[PDB]
Write a protein that binds this ligand. Structure first.
Ligand code: HEC
Ligand code: HEC
Ligand code: HEC
Ligand code: DXC
Length: 71
């Protein structure tokens, strides 16, 4: 399957799966979540544990605006 881009108005956000599969062997951080995770995602989650927060906790991955968002 293909990578997805989130159409944030300030700039597209790429989500490269290959890097995540390699760097996050605990697949259940994202997969086999209960129902509601597709509807639930948004800016609050993205800027929290959905994206940025995991990067902070794992000590790796982008944490600056322009590292995630790109027109
Ligand atoms: C969130 C940050 C994820 C982590 C950590 C892992 N996966 Fe993932 N996966 C995630 C998304 C948002 C998607 C759909 C978009 C995409 O890039 O495909 C997927 C997709 C898969 C797939 C289908 C891949 C394909 O057909 O090309 C598989 C088989 C899969 N994910 C498995 C998987 C495993 C085994 C992981 C841990 C090592 C893993 N994923 C991490 C989100 C995230
Ligand atoms: C842990 C549970 C994570 C979640 C949820 C998300 N990301 Fe992530 N990401 C994670 C790690 C440990 C890393 C480092 C990977 C590396 O090899 O350096 C990353 C990396 C990225 C990257 C950069 C990939 C690269 O080629 O360097 C991007 C662009 C990125 N992450 C974006 C991103 C987004 C948009 C997420 C939410 C939708 C997201 N990540 C979730 C760990 C985790
Ligand atoms: C990745 C780890 C990110 C970092 C660092 C920052 N942002 Fe972000 N942002 C990210 C995603 C995946 C999303 C989309 C949420 C979704 O609905 O899918 C966003 C969202 C925004 C928005 C809202 C965009 C919209 O609703 O169209 C804004 C205005 C925004 N982000 C700005 C922003 C700034 C200023 C940042 C640095 C302070 C920043 N983001 C960091 C992913 C990530
Ligand atoms: C559920 C995990 C981990 C975050 C958490 O613990 O809640 C999060 C991390 C990244 C999230 C995905 C990012 C891309 C997509 C954004 C859509 O708007 C909703 C579906 C997708 C496919 C999201 C589904 C789910 O919300 C994920 C996989």
């Amino acid at each position: 399957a293909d990578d997805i881009v989130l159409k944030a108005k300030n700039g597209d956000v790429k989500l490269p799966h290959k890097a995540h599969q390699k760097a996050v062997p605990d697949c259940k951080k994202c997969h086999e979540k209960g129902p509601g995770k597709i509807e639930g995602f948004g800016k609050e989650m993205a800027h929290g544990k959905g994206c940025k927060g995991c990067h902070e906790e794992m000590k790796k991955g982008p944490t600056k605006c322009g590292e995630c968002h790109k027109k």
